[PDB]
């Protein structure tokens with residue numbers, strides 16, 4: 345009888361959505377036991393009696409002094425991860441007296457495919473982001489072949505139209521590690537390999553819906569053995585008190601997810617735009633970053649806006665008082681804004697965020713871009729006006745309503761995501777081959 349090993353990626357918003365799916369799987373397959381592996385800090389943060397969490401090593405050696413490189417924690421985790429997860433799984437097998445029958449893992453868990461092969465079990469990677477970024481990873485060699493790896497200077501606005509479903513994607517929209525950025529880094533090489541091995545998975549599953557882009561869906565089904573859209577998850581499953589008192593569609597919510605803050609000059613520009621427009625606001629800003637706020641900003645905005653280290657974001661976005669979302673365009677944030685019917689103001693930083701920005705602005709038309717890709721005072725005030733007071737916002741809100749309805753049908757009875765989820769339950773329910 346099944347024992348599903350679940351290997352979480354413990355940085356950014358990766359472990360939470362994975363746990364979210366595992367909970368649905370555990371309810372759907374009550375006879376299967378689920379062992380959820382992440383770091384202790386990740387597990388404490390994110391946490392069905394058939395699920396048990398196991399803390400695995402963060403990969404940091406006992407006396408280690410950090411160099412202070414960016415994503416040094418991520419490198420240390422990744423290098424040790426194969427062995428960290430192995431030791432966790434040994435523990436879980438011993439506790440349950442059940443061999444692992446299925447390996448579910450974040451697609452960023454490098455070597456999960458090899459671990460599953462060695463154990464003789466199915467590999468079911470979860471892509472936590474959008475099919476746009478899934479597509480470009482799976483086509484990394486073709487993209488590199490076509491564009492080259494010596495840079496894109498003078499070609500930033502050229503179109504990725506040779507890749508199915510990517511006609512609106514520009515060269516500059518690509519993730520770091522594809523054709524620009526540090527192509528030789530550990531993160532780049534691992535991502536490169538991931539893209540190459542994903543076609544060998546039993547099934548790749550994703551928090552999205554097929555009808556988001558039928559051509560992209562068809563293309564990915566052609567590149568992968570089995571490809572299963574099972575979302576949007578969020579349509580399946582004092583901030584609020586303050587919002588209660590605000591006019592409909594009048595509040596700007598600002599957040600950059602779990603690991604990103606804009607640079608100090610952009611923190612300033614945002615504070616100036618909020619002040620000059622006097623737009624009511626809730627700004628999720630790391631407390632440490634408050635040092636970058638201009639003297640007097642908090643005092644002058646106290647009567648109409650709040651700066652908090654953490655907001656109940658999905659609930660805020662669902663609140664009738666919210667009229668716009670200034671976002672880094674992370675995948676989970678985008679779908680929560682769609683659930684709430686709130687137009688985006690896009691300021692992507694890295695990873696898949698530019699692709700998501702492009703999707704929002706140019707494909708779905710549910711948000712606006714910031715001219716220059718950086719916060720300026722006047723640029724932000726224009727976005728606030730366009731969305732909150734002008735016809736553009738009315739159109740974006742209409743686009744959001746139609747998009748949400750499609751998404752809702754995908755997760756309804758007989759929906760594409762509902763049917764795909766049945767397929768995935770069937771896969772994780774399968775005992776280990778004899």
Ligand SMILES: O=c1ccn([C@@H]2O[C@H](COP(=O)(O)OP(=O)(O)O)[C@@H](O)[C@H]2O)c(=O)[nH]1
Pocket residue numbers: 356357358599600601602603604628653654655656657658673674675676677678680
């Ligand atoms: O103040 C905050 C900031 C973010 N989030 C949650 O953090 C997640 C951000 O996910 P995303 O994919 O957008 O960005 P990431 O954190 O991975 O960069 C979302 O579920 C947000 O609702 C939140 O609850 N409160």
